[model samples]
Target: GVTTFVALYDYESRTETDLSFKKGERLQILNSSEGDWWLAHSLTTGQTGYIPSNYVAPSD
Candidate 1:
């Protein structure tokens, strides 16, 4: 399924800190080995992260 979330930070650094998704935006759900957590790539830079599934949705 394709999930979605807004970019809380226009430019985030996965190598520096933990970035959070925006309150509302569309995000495609990738693979997640951590259950409730999902590994996603930034639509802009392809920065990856393990974010809470709650932060995203099937329908943004």
Candidate 2:
């Protein structure tokens, strides 16, 4: 189940990932997942690529 929808707020790209997504985006994450990046889907723009732990909770 979706934990949230566009729950991301004040999110700025710490890298070139540009994770600052509007509308709603989906992300899948898990423990032991090794990577310097993450992936997410934009229901708003329908763009998918390296996003940082969208499934995770807020940072601030």
Tens-place lDDT digits, model 1, residues 9-42? 3333355344445544345557643477666765
How many pairs of residues collide in each model?
7, 1
**Model 1 stretches with alpha carbons more than 4 Å out:** 1-18, 32-34
Model 2, runs deviating above 4 Å: 1-4, 23-37, 54-60
Candidate 1: 10-residue stretch with minimal lDDT: 8-17
Task: Write one digit per residue (lDDT tens) for candidate 2, span 1-60.
Answer: 332234354455566654565423444432323565555555556655555554344321
Q: lDDT (0-100) at residue 19 of candidate 2?
A: 58
TM-score of 1: 0.47
31 in model 2: Cα distance from truth in Å?
13
In order, candidate lDDTs are 0.53, 0.47
